[PDB]
Amino acid sequence: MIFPKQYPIINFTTAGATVQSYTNFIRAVRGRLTTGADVRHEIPVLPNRVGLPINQRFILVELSNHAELSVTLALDVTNAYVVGYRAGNSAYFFHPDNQEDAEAITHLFTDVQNRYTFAFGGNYDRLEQLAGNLRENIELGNGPLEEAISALYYYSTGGTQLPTLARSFIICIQMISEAARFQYIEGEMRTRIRYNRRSAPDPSVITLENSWGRLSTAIQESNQGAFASPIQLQRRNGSKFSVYDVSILIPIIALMVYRCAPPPSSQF
Numbered sequence: 001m002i003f004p005k006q007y008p009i010i011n012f013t014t015a016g017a018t019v020q021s022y023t024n025f026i027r028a029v030r031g032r033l034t035t036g037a038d039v040r041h042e043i044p045v046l047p048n049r050v051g052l053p054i055n056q057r058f059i060l061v062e063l064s065n066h067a068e069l070s071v072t073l074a075l076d077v078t079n080a081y082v083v084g085y086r087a088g089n090s091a092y093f094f095h096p097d098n099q100e101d102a103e104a105i106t107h108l109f110t111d112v113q114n115r116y117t118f119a120f121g122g123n124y125d126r127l128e129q130l131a132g133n134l135r136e137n138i139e140l141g142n143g144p145l146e147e148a149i150s151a152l153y154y155y156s157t158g159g160t161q162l163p164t165l166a167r168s169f170i171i172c173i174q175m176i177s178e179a180a181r182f183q184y185i186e187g188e189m190r191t192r193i194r195y196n197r198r199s200a201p202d203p204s205v206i207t208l209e210n211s212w213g214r215l216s217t218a219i220q221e222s223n224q225g226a227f228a229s230p231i232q233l234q235r236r237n238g239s240k241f242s243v244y245d246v247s248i249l250i251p252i253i254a255l256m257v258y259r260c261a262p263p264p265s266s267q268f
């Protein structure tokens, strides 16, 4: 019959999505990821991996679409990573890259008849290669997300083709995980929705997506707030600039992955 623990579900439909409904979506996702506050330098920290019960390890994001089809993604609460998805009576997972993760995964969609684990991992690195295109060439926006939910849904019956599915994962990851991770990327998807525009991310968006782990680390290691090494970012035009300390990042980044036990207190 059973196992334990039902994960929090947050719903969102692309059918007539507005700025208000997407803002609400992204704030409920963050509200469910960070359990109130471990805060370093005025940015909340994500739950620490070691010592976190399986019962609090995942959150579910149910996406429905104008064609009345739904796909539920499963995100890991430690890093907001999309670990797999469920479409009807089938579940698919990216290859776990260590064993506690592999077994954490077995708690996720236990009721489905048909569960599969892909051989490959789910990082942008592999996804782009499978999709046959870079994130710079893939359009983001409500129309793209609508389309992606259908592709994900028909993978199960052979509608398929792995390029298309890999490509639909890139769209989902950026509009949900990255938007939750960065206030700037939530802003970028919000501009696309308020104008019913679809367009690829420019270099400023992509370089923050590649830099998140490193930004999380530099901020938690910083002496007072200054980085022991500057992170190199990009402007919309492609030019690079250095970031020397946390302060300019506070309106840009929304959540950081846990890296270190907090050296001072500050969070109370």
Ligand SMILES: Nc1nc(O)c2nc(CNc3ccc(C(=O)O)cc3)cnc2n1
Binding pocket: 079, 080, 081, 082, 083, 094, 122, 123, 124, 173, 177, 178, 209, 210, 212, 213, 257
């Ligand atoms: N499936 C998937 N889902 C994501 O949310 C994601 N995010 C990024 C952005 N960068 C990373 C990379 C690694 C990790 C970590 O190990 O914790 C987190 C974020 C890249 N690929 C990703 N792939």
